[PDB]
Amino acid sequence: MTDLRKLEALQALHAELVAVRQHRFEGLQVLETLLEEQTDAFKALIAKPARDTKDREALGKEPKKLKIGEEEYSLNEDFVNDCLKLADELDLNEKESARILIDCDAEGDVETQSRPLWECGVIRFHQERKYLLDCMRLILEIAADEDIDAGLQESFGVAAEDKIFGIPPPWERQVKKFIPRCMEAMKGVRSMLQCMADKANARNMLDNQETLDFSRLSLVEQHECLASILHAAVQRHHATIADFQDFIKILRKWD
């Protein structure tokens, strides 16, 4: 299709990167078109809006009609309950959490997996971070491939400098560097995984066991992807002594 949502956009983009990596350049013109539509996605690696009270009190006060962007939806007593549940488990904003659940109703994945609607929101949320971060590794990996055309090898290189590292190209040009965002990004994965075991162990001490396992797998994969991206960025001599000292301190504080 052409009007793909965020999830379908990242899943389709991932397939294109694999083609170029597996010596298949049949999607060059289609690849460049995706990086421009997801420019805002590559800028921020992973960032969940903090849970606000304005939407919490407003969502439950008039759970009749919801307006997200240009489209409109109708909320019922059943769907509204899934929004508060998803927002609490992941500590995500009600507006952002609702959009995730709406994407499941449209695509209709509840029947493909046969799971509660509120649980699908957790999987859909983790899939975004997976492809959003995993696709970045392919860009840098292809940009360093020596067994491809020199021209194509340089296209993905300059693109990653601006899309991932937020560094504009040489033909042009308050903002925060990439490393400090990556360090804080990985930090959120650790705090989210730690609070997950504490809460999960409390209730465990069900039909969601496999979902929790898949979420842990996605989290560890995202952490590995972030580590690889950090290594690649450091390989371009884009670090300093402060980051080294911070990493040494984090290692010294390893438990």
Partner: peptide, 10 residues
């Protein structure tokens, strides 16, 4: 909307 509760109030 891309604005969290706090950001919106501001």
């Amino acid at each position: 909307s891309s604005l969290d509760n706090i950001e919106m109030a501001y």
